[PDB]
Amino acid sequence: CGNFGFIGSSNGSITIYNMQSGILRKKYKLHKRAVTGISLDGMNRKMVSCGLDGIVGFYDFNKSTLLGKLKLDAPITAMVYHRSSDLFALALDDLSIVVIDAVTQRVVRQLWGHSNRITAFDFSPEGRWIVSASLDSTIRTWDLPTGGCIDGIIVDNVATNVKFSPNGDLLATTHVTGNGICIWTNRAQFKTVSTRTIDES
């Protein structure tokens, strides 16, 4: 709704502001290391969080009540939420992409395969795909219902960031050398595929 401002500090405080009047509003403090990512479901009811201490947080936004949290295996480096399917993806230090349900506070999937550090990732708009890119010069796509890596693209220069357009058409990459922003076209005419992994170096 655009009313609220969520800010997470490196000493672990999560504070909450108004976006209209610029005023301090509300304060939460559960993490004890740097809060590396905050999001909120589209119904503005359940508030998720992540720390470097392997803790994933689950709050009511309507109250200040402390609903539930999880202990994981590694620090969490990035968090991107998908709103119309109520999931979220976490990039851990064990080079694995964990996919977690938002409703029932349950881990549902864990995906392996990137040989180096996960850099950026994004949900497809219909919520079926995840595209990540890493320092193994790979850009991989991951089908959530099958749990399997469906395509990698092995490039010659490693892109800093990637984002889907909200329309299902364009994929945006930003690279280290050169100043431009490369744009990719989602085909989206057809396919019946589920085919698989490792190929040419």
Binding site: C1, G42, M43, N44
Partner: protein
Amino acid sequence: VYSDVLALSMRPDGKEVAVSTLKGQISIFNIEDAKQVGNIDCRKDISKFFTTIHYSFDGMAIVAGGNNNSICLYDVPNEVLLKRFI
């Protein structure tokens, strides 16, 4: 309490009544007049109105349409679900 109404819409239970106030606030109350929500304006100029409103059949949503190139979704609680538009 407020604001001359034009749009009335009934729940299929006989228990809830949805009204459109004389501004962008769209409001609901039951048959024991407990006013649940009043809700925010109807945007998208290329003044603001409240012309028609309808209670969905499952009892979990209402749809607001004025005369301002916009149409809004709402649930029984407060939240703006989706705004489609021409």
